Each structure stands twice: as structure tokens, then as C-alpha cells.
């Protein structure tokens, strides 16, 4: 694994241009490599024994798996040394996704709704990255709009591997109660009270379904109530549906495939990828250009 003592000072190799993100822990800046001018994202996090396992897990995931074109590509890691009365800071340096998150995009779109063709394109890109991780026995465990990013060219990249899981076998399971309630699968929530319950990669597929709804309706199901309430109604409520009858029958059938509550009747990542909403799609390059154009207009 990664050893935080071997990391060097970033000196004046990168300059922080502006703040672009604040998620769960630390802050992300637009970074600029001062010699070449190359842009990168720089996630800055105070080093602390309390946060160090989460920081190492994200760094190892990125080192091993971000070569895939749907994961933001890892460049390196530094540590800014600070005087004795001030915590040291880890700089995690990766590919800059210049257009922000999917959540960002939904916020700045009129009516907080994406065109279905953009939803289909984004979902397929998410599914491809997920497919890469699941083949490598990784569960992401935090799929949601905030952690799906867009490049300046409307390419899609997953980020945020802090709470992801590395399994040993294909069949291997996990039972850690973790995530954001609105996006959590029922079988993940079941690990709160049931010590014998477990889940696997299929939980990422549920979260993907909630993310498609988030893109279609501007928020996940149940976001009108506090997260405690939602945690206890997700297992009891019937699986969420799209409310508007105007979406295509394809998209409705896809949401139905993602959101099977009984996870052993939920299709695996590979069957879901052949779903006509994902498979029967116009050219990647054509849809991408339209989305790139809308991102630029609304900027």
C-alpha cells in the first residue's frame, strides 16, 4: 500500500488557481503545473491519524485503476509541510474535469432536468467505469451526481474512492453500513440492523439508478425529507419510479432494471449493459457534442 512518509513537498510545482469543490473532506482546486501550464485537480486534505485510512484507500484505488478512461486519471501525491503549529496537507493531483459535476450541471440547467439522450450517454459512461471496477472486484459505494464529473469535452469521469471496497473473490461480499442515504441500496441499509446481511457490486447498480432519477428530476427520490426518514423508508417503500409519463418507454424500463429491491433479482453489471436504453444509443461522438454545447452555453 501507499506510505505517506515517502511523499515530498509540492514546492512551487503547482499553483492553486481557484476552488472548484468541497465534498466530504478537504477541498479541490483547479491546479496549474507552472512550468508547462498543464491543468490538474488538486484535492487538499489535512493529514491526521483520524482521516488517514480513508486518504490511503482513495490513493491506492486511483493508482491501480484510474488508467481507465471513465475514471479521473491519477497523476501523483505530495505533502505540503507546514510550521510546527499547523497540520500538514496532502495534495492529491489528478486529471482536471473542467466542466464540474453532474449535480453542478443539473443545477444550472433550466428546470433542473437533463435531456434523456444525455442521461443515456452519461449512464452508459458510468456503467462502463463501474464495469471496469467490478471486474477488478472493487465496489465504489458512493455513486451519485456529486461524484460523476464532466471534462471540457463532455467526457464522463468517476471520482471519490474514499469509501470504496477492494474484494478478494468475484463472489466476495461486504457488510459495512456506509454511504449517502438517498443513494443507498436496500441491502446496504439492511446491514444496520441485520448482522448477517451482506451486499456486493449490485449495490452500485442501484445507486446508478438513483443517479439517473437525479438527472431526470433534479434530485433523488425522497429528498423532500430528512436523511434519517429516508433510511427507514427505502426498504419499505416500493422501488422508485420516474413520475413523468413523458420519458420514453426505454428509459422507464431501464430505471425498472436498476431498481430491483431484491438484489438477487437485480441484474448484474453485465446484463444491465445490454439494456436497450444503454445499448441502442446513437453515436457516442454525436450525443457528446450536443452535451458539450449545452455545458458551454450555460457557462
Amino acid at each position: 500500500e501507499i506510505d505517506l512518509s515517502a511523499l515530498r513537498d509540492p514546492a512551487g510545482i503547482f499553483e492553486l488557481v481557484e476552488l472548484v469543490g468541497n465534498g466530504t473532506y478537504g477541498q479541490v482546486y483547479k491546479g496549474r503545473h507552472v512550468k508547462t501550464g498543464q491543468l490538474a485537480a488538486i484535492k487538499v486534505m489535512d493529514v491526521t491519524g483520524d482521516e488517514e485510512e480513508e486518504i490511503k484507500q482513495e490513493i491506492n484505488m486511483l493508482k491501480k485503476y484510474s488508467h481507465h478512461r471513465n475514471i479521473a486519471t491519477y497523476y501523483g501525491a505530495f505533502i505540503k509541510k507546514n510550521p510546527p503549529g499547523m497540520d500538514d496537507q496532502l495534495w492529491l493531483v489528478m486529471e482536471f474535469c473542467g466542466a464540474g459535476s453532474v449535480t453542478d450541471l443539473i443545477k444550472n440547467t433550466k428546470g433542473n432536468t437533463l435531456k434523456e439522450e444525455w442521461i443515456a450517454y452519461i449512464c452508459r459512461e458510468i456503467l462502463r467505469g463501474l464495469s471496469h471496477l467490478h471486474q477488478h472486484k472493487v465496489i465504489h459505494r458512493d455513486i451519485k451526481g456529486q461524484n460523476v464529473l464532466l471534462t471540457e469535452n463532455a467526457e464522463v469521469k468517476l471520482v471519490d474512492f474514499g469509501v470504496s471496497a477492494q474484494l478478494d473473490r468475484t463472489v466476495g461480499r461486504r457488510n459495512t453500513f456506509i454511504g449517502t442515504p438517498y443513494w443507498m441500496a436496500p441491502e446496504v441499509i439492511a446491514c444496520d440492523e441485520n448482522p448477517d446481511a451482506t451486499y456486493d457490486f449490485k449495490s452500485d447498480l442501484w445507486s446508478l439508478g438513483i443517479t439517473a432519477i437525479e438527472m431526470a428530476e433534479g434530485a433523488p427520490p425522497l429528498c423532500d425529507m430528512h436523511p434519517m426518514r429516508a433510511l427507514f423508508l427505502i426498504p419499505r417503500n416500493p422501488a422508485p419510479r420516474l413520475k413523468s409519463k413523458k420519458w420514453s418507454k426505454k428509459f422507464q424500463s431501464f430505471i425498472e432494471s436498476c431498481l430491483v429491491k431484491n438484489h438477487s433479482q437485480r441484474p448484474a453489471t453485465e446484463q444491465l449493459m445490454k439494456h436497450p436504453f444503454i445499448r441502442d444509443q446513437p453515436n457516442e461522438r454525436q450525443v457528446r457534442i450536443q452535451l458539450k454545447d449545452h455545458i458551454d452555453r450555460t457557462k
Binding site: 466530504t24 456529486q146 456506509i178 449517502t180 438517498y182 423532500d224 436523511p227 426518514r229
Partner: peptide, 17 residues
């Protein structure tokens, strides 16, 4: 709001209501 982390912690991070 919020998100569930390890060890009985939460943080601001997707929600509230």
C-alpha cells in the same frame, strides 16, 4: 443532508430535509 462515514460519523455531503 449528510453522508455516512466509518465509525459512527457523518458529515455534510448530499443531503437534508
Amino acid at each position: 443532508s449528510w453522508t455516512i462515514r466509518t465509525r459512527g460519523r457523518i458529515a455534510t455531503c448530499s443531503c437534508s430535509c
